[PDB]
Swiss-Prot record:
It comes from the Eukaryota. This is Tyrosine-protein phosphatase non-receptor type 23. Signal peptide: none annotated. Disulfide bonds: none annotated. TPR repeats lie at residues 250-283. The gene is PTPN23. Changing residue 232 to Q: In NEDBASS; uncertain significance. It is found in: Nucleus; Cytoplasm; Cytoplasmic vesicle; Endosome. It is linked to Neurodevelopmental disorder and structural brain anomalies with or without seizures and spasticity: An autosomal recessive disorder characterized by global developmental delay, brain abnormalities, mainly ventriculomegaly and/or brain atrophy, intellectual disability, absent speech, peripheral spasticity, and microcephaly. Additional variable features include early-onset seizures, optic atrophy, and dysmorphic facial features. Early death may occur. The lineage of its organism: Eukaryota, Metazoa, Chordata, Craniata, Vertebrata. Belongs to the protein-tyrosine phosphatase family. Non-receptor class subfamily. Interacts with GRAP2 and GRB2. Interacts with UBAP1. Interacts with CHMP4B. The chain holds residues 1 to 361 of 1636 of the full protein.
Amino acid sequence: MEAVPRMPMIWLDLKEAGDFHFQPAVKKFVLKNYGENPEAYNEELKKLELLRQNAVRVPRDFEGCSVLRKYLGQLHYLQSRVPMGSGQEAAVPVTWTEIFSGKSVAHEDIKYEQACILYNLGALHSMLGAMDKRVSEEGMKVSCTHFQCAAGAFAYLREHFPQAYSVDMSRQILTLNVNLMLGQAQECLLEKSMLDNRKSFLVARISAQVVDYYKEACRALENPDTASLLGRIQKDWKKLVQMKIYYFAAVAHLHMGKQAEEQQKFGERVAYFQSALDKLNEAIKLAKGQPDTVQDALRFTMDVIGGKYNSAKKDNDFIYHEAVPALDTLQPVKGAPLVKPLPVNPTDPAVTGPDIFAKLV
């Protein structure tokens, strides 16, 4: 199974930015509150406006992440010296496009700008995670980290910002995004654990957790309100996710049968391989219409599980003569969560660079 073809991964589009005319409001504030020449900080203002145009049209590569993190950190450093939040003195309109409707949504709130950047940091991480072939140890590790970082950005957004600046960043949609991203992170780790040939029981538990994360996403996708908001995106996500629930349930029970093999529980081995085959047959049904990438992974896995089942049953029928337990007596596999949303510290100097606005007060 370490050589199974990789399943495709879902990634999220980045949001499109509108205007954020911060320069006039910063100049008035410096004049009326610091008493200094309003244009003594034009080079700091020039650095920020350049950084914004770079961020709102960011390159879709790993370097793009540092650009977004730079701009996000510098917005924090600006907010801590110039009050531009909701209701505050120097607040100006911030406009971005809500991604599911295409409608412009404006708020006079610098935290809306921060939120949309953080959203795009999560989305870019999801795209970089989904781009790798995931065939090397380092590519599997890096993809896993990108999906955890994506989860981290959407989780931070959900926890630290006035909920619902727009409906693409509502708490329930962000939670769907987190659970999908963690499910994809855990899938990357499952692939890595099979390459590393970890203990069969641990691999089963890792796979069971992939199922658990994808069940959380699937339940959220079945919410009619979310289906309505996402439109055909909900159909495309749900088809892949529901298929993967049965696929990784098959992979889990395959590895429970390998544990039984190792323990010389040869009737239990047959039962788990039979259950794995039943779960895989449902996944193949649910995969109708999916791309060849999905079919190639399922075809490969059917060869593995079908061959293991036929030989386990032959061995048991002609050698071991052990009783085969009913499938509904098998101990369920408890997922092993080995991923988490990974930090967004917006003001870590190692990532923000020098504070553009250090020479303010």
